[PDB]
Amino acid sequence: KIFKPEELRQALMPTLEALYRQDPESLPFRQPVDPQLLGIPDYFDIVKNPMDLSTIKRKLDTGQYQEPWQYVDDVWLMFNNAWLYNRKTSRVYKFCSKLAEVFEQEIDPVMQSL
C-alpha cells in the first residue's frame, strides 16, 4: 500500500485459480448469469450487482483492483448473490458454499502476506 498492479495480480491469482479448479462447483460461476437466456426476469430485481469468475478474472488482469479488499469484495458479492437468489439445497447454492469454503482457506494467508 501502495500496490503495484502486476504484484497484486500475482499474489491474488492463485486464490482465483483455486476457485476455477473446482469441478463441478465452479461451473455455474465461470460466466455471467444471463436472465434473458435463462427466462428468470426476476434476477436483476434481487441481484443488483452481478458478479462471476470471468468478470473477477478480467478485473484482476486489467488493473481494476487498486487494493486487495476490492477483489475480496467481488468474490463475496458473487457468493452473496447466489446465496440470496437460490434455494439452499439447490445445486448453485451448494456449489457456491463449496467455492466459499475453498476461498476462505486460500485468501487468509494471502491477505496477511499483503
Q: At 21, list the grid cell.
A: 479448479
Contacts 24+ apart (CB under 8 A), 103-111: 103/15, 103/18, 103/19, 103/75, 103/79, 106/14, 106/15, 106/18, 107/15, 107/72, 107/75, 110/11, 110/12, 110/14, 110/15, 110/68, 111/68, 111/72
Q: At 10, list the grid cell.
A: 500475482
Method by which this entry was solved: X-ray
Reported resolution in A? Answer: 1.8
Q: Which DSSP symbol is given to 28?
A: G
Q: What is the dihedral of CA 41, 93, 32, 26, to 10 degrees?
A: -160
Q: Which residue has the cell 470471468?
A: 54
Q: At 108, list the grid cell.
A: 487468509
Q: At 59, list the grid cell.
A: 478485473
Looking at the chain, list the stretches that DSSP marks H as alpha helix, in order from N- to C-terminal side.
5-20, 35-38, 43-46, 53-61, 68-85, 91-113
Domain borders along the chain are 1-114
Distances (CA, A) of 104 to 2, 16, 35: 24, 11, 29
Q: Are 92 and 86 contacting, i.e. CB atoms less than 8 angstroms apart?
A: yes
Architecture per CATH, domain 1-114, reads as: Up-down Bundle (1.20)
